[PDB]
Design a binder for this molecule. Structure first.
Ligand SMILES: [Zn+2]
Lengths: 386, 141
């Protein structure tokens, strides 16, 4: 997954900035009806032209000159940036050390490289439907997390285009909470804690957290299908050798015994469960628990979190419907209403949306559908405004 | 007066008014006041010769950057201002211009064993450097 020729990108942005951007809807979605003064003007942008010359201190008063300059330059990477304490483009006027970042929309990102600890379907630049099963399942848990135990309803979801998916939520006041709260929620959702260094990455303690209960109820509906259908992870020495090396040892030979007398990958896990029923997670009491087996399942499909992007007030990320030149693909709105019907391969690139319009507004092609999610969130905002 | 014998270590014979008529009636003691003034200026020079006021003040002004002719005259505003401005107007600011502790209850009482003297020479420049204070760097209001 990438782009194949930067030759078209100049003219593509040339037309896009001209007549392919919800400058009305965007000015709205940012300024938020202008309910606050010096609200938009300090809401920052960062722009990146040829050779990736990324530059801070970018902002314009209202939609008109915003457009005019966007079309004057056509930046090739655009980050929305927190409303810092004062005038961004005139930052160096006040006494130094007095310009900082007050209030930021709360951001989240999850990578596909996250799953690379076991991901064997495709590469770091190439994908397939198998890994995308994760981009279909993981978001469900994270979404419903904020949908049922965080008292928010201003959620918005996008897939970057190459690896990550984004969530730029602008909740009533969370836009204006302390970095401490950021780190807090991060710590909260950071359940399976594993990169490429530690093996027993989940020392899940005894008593569960009902959050984890709903997590499980989601796991036993969407993991095993992908696992033993799209991968059949018990296929050769390679995969399960990246598996059995996190396990206690009293039975650690029976699993391989089931490994290499096989014509499928089902009775293996079946006898796994069986011996677990005769295994003792607790030598003390009669609570034979799914600690290790479900740690296995979850860790093999769990949203790996970032420890610095979901707390900092300096990392800025892309704009709604701003092109990712290095995939063609542009920001695709993602919804629970669409999680059951998404495919990454069919959704269009900048090249493809261009060839779409290369045939008045977004009101003709599938871009009006794609921004139905946008204007839907905006509708909710109208309902958010009293 | 006291300095005559502290650093300079000699005598200072002095004569009030009512003896000035005596010395009007005198050639030995009048001439003696004359040679006394001779020695006065002499010791006055010896002051410089020992304390080395001249090259000291000279080097200071050299590093100070302000009129030495207005240095000896006494001043701390000059030897700070006309120094700081050197750098501050390499930094393209614009400055304003001219117009018009803690005691610790000394616990008095004789002390017999040895006593030590701690000097906090270079305390304020020390603290200022240590904590990086500078005009531009405080929301001062
Ligand atoms: Zn694959």
């Amino acid at each position: 997954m990438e782009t194949f020729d930067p030759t078209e990108l100049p003219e593509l942005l040339k037309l896009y900035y001209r007549r392919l951007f919800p400058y009305s809807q965007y000015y709205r979605w940012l300024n938020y009806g202008g309910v606050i003064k010096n609200y938009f003007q300090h809401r920052e942008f960062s722009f990146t032209l040829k050779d990736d010359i990324y530059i801070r201190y970018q902002s314009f008063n209202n939609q008109s000159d915003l457009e005019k300059e966007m079309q004057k330059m056509n930046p090739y990477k655009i980050d929305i940036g927190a409303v810092y304490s004062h005038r961004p483009n005139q930052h160096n006027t006040v006494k130094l050390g007095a310009f900082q970042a007050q209030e930021k929309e709360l951001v989240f990102d999850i990578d596909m490289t996250d799953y690379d600890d076991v991901r064997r379907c495709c590469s770091s630049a190439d994908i397939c439907p198998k890994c995308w099963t994760l981009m279909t399942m993981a978001i469900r848990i994270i979404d419903r997390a904020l949908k049922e135990d965080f008292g928010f309803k201003h959620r918005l979801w996008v897939y970057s285009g190459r690896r990550g998916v984004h969530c730029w939520v602008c909740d009533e006041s969370v836009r204006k909470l302390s970095s401490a709260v950021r780190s807090g929620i991060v710590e909260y959702l950071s359940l399976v804690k594993g990169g490429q260094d530690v093996k027993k990455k989940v020392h899940l303690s005894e008593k569960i957290h009902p959050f984890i209960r709903k997590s499980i109820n989601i796991i036993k509906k969407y993991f095993e299908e992908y696992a033993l259908v799209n991968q059949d992870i018990l296929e050769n020495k390679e995969s399960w050798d990246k598996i059995l090396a996190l396990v206690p040892e009293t039975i650690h030979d029976e699993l391989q015994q089931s490994f290499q007398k096989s014509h499928n990958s089902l009775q293996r896990w079946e006898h796994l469960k069986k011996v677990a029923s005769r295994y003792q997670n607790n030598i003390k009491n009669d609570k034979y628990g799914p600690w290790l087996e479900w740690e296995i399942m979850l860790q093999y499909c769990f949203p790996r979190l970032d420890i610095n992007v979901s707390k900092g007030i300096n990392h800025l990320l892309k704009s709604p419907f701003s092109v990712h030149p290095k995939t063609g693909r542009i920001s695709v709105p993602i919804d629970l209403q669409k999680v059951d019907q998404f495919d990454p391969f069919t959704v269009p690139t900048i090249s493809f949306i261009c060839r779409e319009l290369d045939a008045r507004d977004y009101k003709k092609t599938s871009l009006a559908p794609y921004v139905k999610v946008f204007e839907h969130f905006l509708e909710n905002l109208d309902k958010s405004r009293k | 007066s006291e300095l005559v014998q502290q650093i300079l270590k000699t005598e200072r014979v002095v004569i009030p008014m009512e003896n000035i008529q005596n010395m009007y009636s005198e050639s030995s003691q009048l001439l003696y006041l004359l040679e006394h003034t001779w020695k006065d200026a002499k010791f006055i020079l010896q002051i410089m010769c020992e304390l080395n006021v001249l090259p000291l003040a000279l080097q200071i002004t050299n590093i100070a950057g302000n009129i030495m002719s207005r240095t000896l005259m006494g001043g701390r505003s000059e030897r700070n201002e006309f120094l700081l401005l050197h750098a501050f107007y390499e930094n393209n600011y614009i400055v304003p211009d001219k117009q018009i502790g803690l005691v610790l209850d000394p616990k008095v009482g004789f002390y017999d064993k040895f006593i030590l003297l701690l000097d906090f020479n270079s305390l304020y420049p020390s603290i200022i450097q240590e904590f990086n204070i500078c005009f531009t760097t405080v929301q001062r209001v």
